[PDB]
Design a protein around this ligand. Sequence first.
Ligand SMILES: Cc1c(C(=O)C2=C(O)CCCC2=O)ccc2c1C(=O)N(CCF)CC(=O)N2C
Ligand SMILES: Cc1c(C(=O)C2=C(O)CCCC2=O)ccc2c1C(=O)N(CCF)CC(=O)N2C
Ligand SMILES: [Co+2]
Ligand SMILES: [Co+2]
Lengths: 382, 382
Amino acid sequence: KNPKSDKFKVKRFHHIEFWCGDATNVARRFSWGLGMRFSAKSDLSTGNMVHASYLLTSGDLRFLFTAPYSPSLSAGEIKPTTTASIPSFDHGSCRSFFSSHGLGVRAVAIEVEDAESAFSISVANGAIPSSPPIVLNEAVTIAEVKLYGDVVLRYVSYKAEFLPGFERVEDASSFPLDYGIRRLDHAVGNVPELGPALTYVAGFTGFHQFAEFTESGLNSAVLASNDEMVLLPINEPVHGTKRKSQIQTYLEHNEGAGLQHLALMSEDIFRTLREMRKRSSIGGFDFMPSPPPTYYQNLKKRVGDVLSDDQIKECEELGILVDRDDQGTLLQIFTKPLGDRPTIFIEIIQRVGCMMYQSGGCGGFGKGNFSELFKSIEEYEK
Amino acid sequence: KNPKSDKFKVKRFHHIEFWCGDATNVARRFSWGLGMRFSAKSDLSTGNMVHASYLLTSGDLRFLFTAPYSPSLSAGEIKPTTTASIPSFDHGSCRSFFSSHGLGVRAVAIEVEDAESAFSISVANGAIPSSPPIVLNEAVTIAEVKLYGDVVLRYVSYKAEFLPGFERVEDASSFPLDYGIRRLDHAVGNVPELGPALTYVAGFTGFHQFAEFTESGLNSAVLASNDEMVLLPINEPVHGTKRKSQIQTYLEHNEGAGLQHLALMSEDIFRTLREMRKRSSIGGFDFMPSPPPTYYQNLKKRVGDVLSDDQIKECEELGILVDRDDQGTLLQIFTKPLGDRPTIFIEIIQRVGCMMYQSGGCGGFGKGNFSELFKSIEEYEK
Ligand SMILES: Cc1c(C(=O)C2=C(O)CCCC2=O)ccc2c1C(=O)N(CCF)CC(=O)N2C
Ligand SMILES: Cc1c(C(=O)C2=C(O)CCCC2=O)ccc2c1C(=O)N(CCF)CC(=O)N2C
Ligand SMILES: [Co+2]
Ligand SMILES: [Co+2]
C-alpha cells in the first residue's frame, strides 16, 4: 500500500554532495572510475574565494565535490557579500565534518516544487533546520534540514545551469566519459537506532514505508516519496551475532551515523561493470569479492525465466548479484569503500520489470542476497 | 666550485610524502596521472589503526600518501604501543597541516648513511628538530628536522622493503603502469625571505650553493649535496613588479612557506608527456598552456646542435620547454597545480649532456625560459 502522504511536492533526486579535503583529486578519481563528465565548476577561476566545487554528471546523476579554501581568502566577506556559490557552506562545518567522518556525503539533494515551502513544512513537522531557504539570482532556491548524523537533506527548486554562480566546463577539460550510469536509485543511511531515525524522517517528509526487513548484521526499512522515485533506506546494527555487524563497523570508523551507500542505476549494467572493472587497478574503483561459482549455478533455478543462460554467464564473469521479489528482478554489485575508511561504498544496479515507465524500487534492494550468498559460500567449501 | 662540505654522508632522494585528507583518492589519481605503480601499503589491513599510507613507485621515484584515521581507533595506544608504521605521525599535526595548507608535501626524505648521526649533526648545527631518530624493527632508522614552513627534511638509513610495517601490494591491485618517470631530480621551496632560508638549511646540512639568480617574479638559489644529486632550490618573491609574483600568490594561498614543485626525471620525456597528456582530461594532470609557435621557431637557433628539427617538432607537439647552460641542455614542462589551490605543481624534465653517469643539475633549472617565453609571447602577438 502507498498512502501518498508527502507533505510537499517532491520530484526526483537532484544531486549528491561530497565534502572533501581536496575536491580536485576526488572528482578526478571519481570521473575516471565511474565514467562521469566534468560539467560545471565554482572555484577561484569563477570568482569563488570560499570553496572549490566540481560537478560530475552521467545522465541524470550529479555528483558534487566541495572543499574549503583557506579562510584567509574570504576573511573580509560577510554572508551578504559572500563569493560562495553555495550559501550554506561553512569552512568550519566542512573541516569538522571531514576531520570527524573522512570523505563522505554531506548532502542528499532532492528537487522539489518549492524549496522554501518544503523547508517550512518540514521544520513545522519536526525537521531540525540546517540552512534556511536562500534564493540564488532570483532563479533557484536552496534550503537544508538534518537527515541523520551530519548528513543534510537538501531541497532545491527552480523557477524555470546547475546553480547560479557555477560555470559550464570548457569542452577540452570536459572529456565525454560515459560507462552507462544514468541516475541515483537510492541513498542509504546507517544509524545506531532505526526506530527514532525512521520516525523523524517520515515525520517531517510524509514519506511512507516502502519496504522493511529484520543473522546478517542489520535491520532495515525504506522510506519513499509519493511516486516512490525518491528512496531512502536506513539501517541499524543487530548486536549479538557471530560475525560482526558491518553496520556497527561503519558507525565505529565513521564516528557515528552517516550515509552508507549510493545506488546508481545503469542503463546497461554489463557495460558499466566491464568499464569499471577494466579501471579498478588504474585509478578506478575496486569491487567486493565475487560470489563462488555455486551462486551462479543456483541462479538458473531462480531467474532462468528472466535471464538467458548467456546473460547469467555474463553476470558470473562480472561478479553481478541477482535478486527478485514478486514484481521484478534486480541486478546489483557493490564496490569496496570509496576512500580510506571502511564506510561509504557504491552499488551499481539495474532493474527488470514493473513496466507501466518503470516503477521505483522494482525488485527491491537485494536483501535476499545475504542468505543466498551465505548458502552459495557454504556449498562451495564442500 | 664545489667545496663538498656536507656535514654528514647523504646518498640520494628517497621519497616524498604527501599529507592528505583521503590518501586513497589522491594516490589513485596520481597513479593514473603519472604512471606509478601501487607498491606498498600500511593501513587497517596491515594492522595500522593510526594512519593510512600508500606508496607509489616509478623507477627510483617514491611517492607516499598518508591520511589520519579517526583518533578513536587508536585512543588506547601510547607511542611505546603504537600501531603506526611511521612513528613521527601525529593526528593533530596532520589535520592542522592540511587545514592550513591543503594537499601538499609534508616530507622531503633523503637516504643517508646513518639517520641518527645526520640528525644529531644537523641539530648541533642549527636544525630545528621535528622528530627524533627512531629505529624500526632494528633495520631502518628515521628522523626529521624542519626544512621550511611545515615541510620537514626526513633522514632515512638502512642497516642492510620500503619501511618495516609496510606490506608489498597484492599483484592484482599492483597494475604495472610506467610512463617513463625514473627519479626525483629536485624539490623546490617557496619562502618569504630567501636569505634566512638559505643560511638555515646550508647551515645544518653543509649543502653548498649550486646556482643562483635574481622582472620574472622571483629570486632563487639552489643548495646541493657533495655529488650534487640532492638538489634543493628555494625561491622568494620580488615585490614591486607589474604582473604579480607567482611566489607571492603561492604564499597567500598556501598560508605561508612550503614546497612549490617536484621535478621528476624521465628516461624518455617524449613518451612521458604523450602518456600524461592523453590522460589529462580523464583523471590525470593538466599542463600549463603551451608556448606559441614562435618559441619553437626560436629553438632551432638555440639547440639545433643538440636536437634535430624532428625532435624539436616533437617538443612543439608536446609543449616541451628547452633551456641550456654552458654544459648541458634541459627539456622541461610544468603541470597545472596538483590540487585545489594554486600552490604545488610538478615539473617533468630530462637532461642532455654532462657525461662522465650524468652529473646532477646538467643544464640548470630553466631560468632562461622566463625571458625566452616572454619574448616568444610578444613576437607571436605581432
Ligand atoms: C548494502 C547491501 C545491500 C543493500 O543495498 C541494502 C539497501 O539498499 C537497503 C536494505 C538493506 C541493504 O543492505 C544489499 C546486499 C548486500 C549489501 C552489502 O552491503 N554487503 C556488504 C558490503 F558490500 C554485502 C553483501 O554481501 N550483500 C549481498
Ligand atoms: C618553477 C619554474 C621553473 C623552475 O623549475 C625553477 C627551479 O627548479 C629553481 C629555480 C627557480 C625556478 O623557477 C623554471 C621555469 C618556469 C617555472 C614556472 O614556475 N612557471 C610558473 C608555473 F608553471 C612558469 C614558466 O613559464 N617557467 C618557464
Ligand atoms: Co542498496
Ligand atoms: Co624546477
